[model samples]
Target: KSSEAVSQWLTAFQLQLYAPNFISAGYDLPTISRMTPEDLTAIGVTKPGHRKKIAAEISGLSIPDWLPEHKPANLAVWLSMIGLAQYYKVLVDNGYENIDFITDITWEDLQEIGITKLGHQKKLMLAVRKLAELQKAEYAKY
Candidate 1:
């Protein structure tokens, strides 16, 4: 039953191609709930874009209290591919917890939060852009 749910959920992301990999990785509901971009990568998910999409949806899941704070702290950590500490701090400081909320932020808004380093800024913004695009694609399916 749980496997069916997990399979369905993963299929929603068009990740059915990796269903066997997920099963091999032991991605039950509990594990899936706790899975991060890093975890997926470690388990051989090589596509950055796919990882971002998975991470965003995974972040949408209700996090366990024992794992960490489910708000910006955890979400920021999941989304920030580079300079995680700085990104996490900026998100928490600015109260940007939700993925949808973060996706709405403009480049100017990010600069205002001290993401002034051009490369880092671009990286973060591009990540947000990619995540948003992925979310849009996912939503379009429904």
Candidate 2:
């Protein structure tokens, strides 16, 4: 049943053929849940746009166990899937390691870091906010 959910999710992305590839790579639900863009490429997904789409979807899912949620620098790597990793660098360089700091980030902060593209800035803002929300909710659960 769980694998079937993964199958449906993949099919929604028009990645139906890759189901077998995922299985071949030994990707069960948890592993698939945590996979990065590079992992997909390694599993034989060659198209750039496909990789981008998959990365964006994967990044928005529940936090992977391997990701260091407390480290801001690592978030950049995750956000790289959506093309906002560079701007997040400003936080890493300035010693902002906590996720809460990411929540405090504003559009002006992104502009200060040279994230000038309107679309990119919007995506970064949305992601940061979403991360903050999820992190807060996770905390509340405890």
Candidate 3:
């Protein structure tokens, strides 16, 4: 069931060529959920744009890889990866680089910046949180 679904998902994104590789690897939700670029590359997914797009969608479907807070992907990439580049760019134009205000600022600070809309806040904050989970889980690895 899972393999077929994964192949189905892969093909939907024009990854039909490597669907069988994934199938041979016995891919399931758990397997796909933790997919890495190395794994994708190893399995023949070679295009840079496609990799980013696939990785972006995967971040939505599963948490990012667990790595130390300081070492894991920073917000710029994470924001872009999760398909929220607008918020990523919004902060930058106003001198709020993605790394500077992540945990240093509070909800009030968020207000001071351009993040006034609640719905916008919700998406960024929630996604920001998952990005942290990506960090926390990394700490647990040791």
Candidate 4:
């Protein structure tokens, strides 16, 4: 899944030139969070300072959407599981990473964010609701 949020983040770091390179290689927000400075090596980010900066930001990220499917892994796999892989870019493009999982996002919010299909909107909301419940379960389990 292509993550525009990743592209935006790269751009913010003055690495938009590498956006296409990263996107085509299937790097999404969560995948990026798991990256090390070494990971940027293959991506042609040869500048040590740039790699460090990107790695630093990723390490500090607390992006949304996780349900044990890939809890701290890749959004590509997680979104694919819920059958919303196509909307990967849509969510990230709209900055869904920063959006609150349950407390902030409403069904209408999905609509506003470009989930134009009725079923798609419903499915995503269901998953969002499921994630909220899962988090509650985690909190109680501990």
Candidate 5:
């Protein structure tokens, strides 16, 4: 998706402009956009249909559902999964191990831990699960 399209929904998600590679909102750095349906399945999105549902929901337009009232908690798991994956890169580069399995760690637990130790607020988890299920339904179209 184009940065402008992403901007509409991901307003809170910091976006970079006038660059070859787009940056993500949560992690401020150049990043690839969401994969095409074929690529997503090839990459093994947890539920291929979820992406399809979401894309359909968007009507093939560019904006992500992660913004506005769509900030479902289950979607947070998806977002945080991507966010933590990026963070894990830093951890790995710094000689940290066990980064690969980090996604398996309950993301909300991590959020709670961050709140306990780093002053970050814990995000809701059930909402994230709902978003995941919704997205899963979307991905099926692919």
Candidate 6:
């Protein structure tokens, strides 16, 4: 494919997987359950065993390779991506496929809606690619 074709494919891929408002959906549940700490400071681990299931899920999922090495001081962003992807899969499994959420919106639309700024689009794209790769890897196991 020419670069243009590749770029279009990537756009479609990103739209398919990450275009909606996904961050909050991905991390909130784990944060509330203390299964994984979005903010380590927020954790009150009375019983470490409670986190065992979270640990296994995290292991099987798509965490950036740098995570263990850096030991991110906060996990909000990563957890959010994981959480959203988790539910996105659920929606797709229930036959809600496609990037309909973006059908009426553009990067410009996000800025207009105050959800994001134009400069932020690049950052969002990078996050989407990372999470998409993770999803691809995770799905292969099943």
TM-scores of all candidate predictions against the true structure: 0.43, 0.41, 0.40, 0.46, 0.24, 0.26
| lDDT (tens digit, per residue) of candidate 4 on 69-124 | 32424556667775568877877777775324433577677768767554344445
lDDT of 3 at 42: 62
| Candidate order (lDDT) | 4, 2, 1, 3, 5, 6
Residues 13-74 of candidate 6 have per-residue lDDT tens digits of 34312212222222222222222343221233233543444345434444233212221223
Give candidate 6's root-mean-square deviation (CA, Å).
19.0
User: Considering every candidate listed, which one attains the maximal lDDT?
Assistant: 4
Q: Write one digit per residue (lDDT tens) for candidate 5, span 1-142.
A: 4445445433432221212121222212112233345433432333645555533533444434442234323422444643433343443443333422332345455543442211111122232344455556767995
What is candidate 4's TM-score against the reference? 0.46
lDDT of 6 at 105: 32
Clashing pairs in 2: none
What 10-residue stretch in candidate 2 is worst by lDDT? 63-72
Any residue pairs clashing in model 3, and if so which?
A: 66-138
Estimate the TM-score for candidate 6: 0.26
For each candidate, what is the lDDT?
0.63, 0.63, 0.61, 0.64, 0.35, 0.35
Tens digits of lDDT, candidate 1, 80-126: 43334556667877877667777787868877877664334444555
Runs with alpha carbons beyond 4 Å of true place in candidate 4 = 65-79, 82-142
lDDT of 3 by residue, 33-116 (tens): 666787677656688987887788677685444323442356677556544466766677766676635745455666787676
RMSD over all Cα atoms, model 5: 15.3
- Candidate 2 steric clashes: 0
Stretches off by above 4 angstroms in model 2 are 1-73, 88-91, 94-98
In model 1, how many backbone clashes occur? 0
Which of the two candidates, 2 or 3, achieves a greater lDDT against the reference? 2
- Measure candidate 2: CA RMSD: 11.5
Best by TM-score: 4
Candidate 3's C-alpha runs over 4 A off are 62-142
Candidates 3 and 5 compared: the better one by lDDT is: 3
Give the clashing residue pairs of candidate 4, or none. Answer: none
Clash tally, candidates in order: 0, 0, 1, 0, 22, 2
Q: Candidate 5: lDDT over CA atoms?
A: 0.35
